[PDB]
Amino acid sequence: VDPFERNKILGRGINIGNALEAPNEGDWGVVIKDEFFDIIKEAGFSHVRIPIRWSTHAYAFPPYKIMDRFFKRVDEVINGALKRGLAVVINIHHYEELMNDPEEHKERFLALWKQIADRYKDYPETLFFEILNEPHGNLTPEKWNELLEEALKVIRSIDKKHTIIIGTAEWGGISALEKLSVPKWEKNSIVTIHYYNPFEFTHQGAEWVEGSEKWLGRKWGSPDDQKHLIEEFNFIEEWSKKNKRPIYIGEFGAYRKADLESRIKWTSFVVREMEKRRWSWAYWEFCSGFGVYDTLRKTWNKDLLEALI
Numbered sequence: 001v002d003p004f005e006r007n008k009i010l011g012r013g014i015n016i017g018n019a020l021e022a023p024n025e026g027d028w029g030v031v032i033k034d035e036f037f038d039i040i041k042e043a044g045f046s047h048v049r050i051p052i053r054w055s056t057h058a059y060a061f062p063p064y065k066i067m068d069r070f071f072k073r074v075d076e077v078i079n080g081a082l083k084r085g086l087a088v089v090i091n092i093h094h095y096e097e098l099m100n101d102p103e104e105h106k107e108r109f110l111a112l113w114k115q116i117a118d119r120y121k122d123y124p125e126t127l128f129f130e131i132l133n134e135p136h137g138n139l140t141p142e143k144w145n146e147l148l149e150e151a152l153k154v155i156r157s158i159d160k161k162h163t164i165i166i167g168t169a170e171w172g173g174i175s176a177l178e179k180l181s182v183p184k185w186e187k188n189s190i191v192t193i194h195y196y197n198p199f200e201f202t203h204q205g206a207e208w209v210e211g212s213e214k215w216l217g218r219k220w221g222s223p224d225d226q227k228h229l230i231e232e233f234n235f236i237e238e239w240s241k242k243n244k245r246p247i248y249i250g251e252f253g254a255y256r257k258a259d260l261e262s263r264i265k266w267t268s269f270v271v272r273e274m275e276k277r278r279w280s281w282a283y284w285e286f287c288s289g290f291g292v293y294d295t296l297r298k299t300w301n302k303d304l305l306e307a308l309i
Helices: 001-010 035-042 068-082 095-098 101-118 141-156 225-241 261-278 304-306
Strands: 012-015 047-050 087-091 125-128 164-166 190-194 246-253 280-283
Touching: 001 190, 001 246, 001 280, 047 068, 047 280, 068 087, 095 101, 095 246, 101 125, 101 141, 125 225, 141 164, 190 225, 225 246, 225 261, 246 261, 261 304
Parallel strands: 012 047, 012 280, 047 087, 087 125, 125 164, 164 190, 190 246, 246 280
Antiparallel strands: none
């Protein structure tokens, strides 16, 4: 299998967030309606990324069994998307104890991946396994290198069909990319990066971010801006060429509080730069805070959808 061809198949996408990665689906405002997949496919997207919180739906002690009711729900989400001809990225996302206590939670995490790989091993080749969303905290770059290799071994003992998606430590951005090590023996993986630069721009006024109001009225679009974003992307593309790993920008987006002109400029520029490099990508997100689809009015943000598609 050619991971670069799989990355093309992945193509352009959107996160369905604040859904299955909450403690329970709906806790953070979104329940994934089957209808979403028609809406997303009709808009021109190639895939959906489904953040999933397995840790709150599995037993705490060995054999760490994932609840059957939750597996059936995930089946339903995956198959709903596949049915529209969309590719699907599933992950483990918000395993909070793992980030803080990797030494204890490694075993449970790997047992989760054993069960997931086992259940979906015969699913279509358009399903992608993303090991872990944004490794951070006590799960350092070195420890992530250790964990991801063990995850690869566990998954590969079961499934040699599906492309695996591997993120970076220190919250999944560019900072820890140079530290990332993918075993040479693994030949069907895509590296994922989450891009929100400039952070002060994209997160201006972000309520969950300390001192973010200091950045309100921040704009984007200047010649300097473009140069920098291009430079940061050159870094990623360089690493990609040197290591021969395809790239997936699994998350990117600007918060609603940024002025709309700059939001459009930033979004359309990021998109065009990524597509220049044949990178797959997924917008954050479908229908919440960073949302571009209004589920009540049943309408897309036209300006932003145009920037994306």
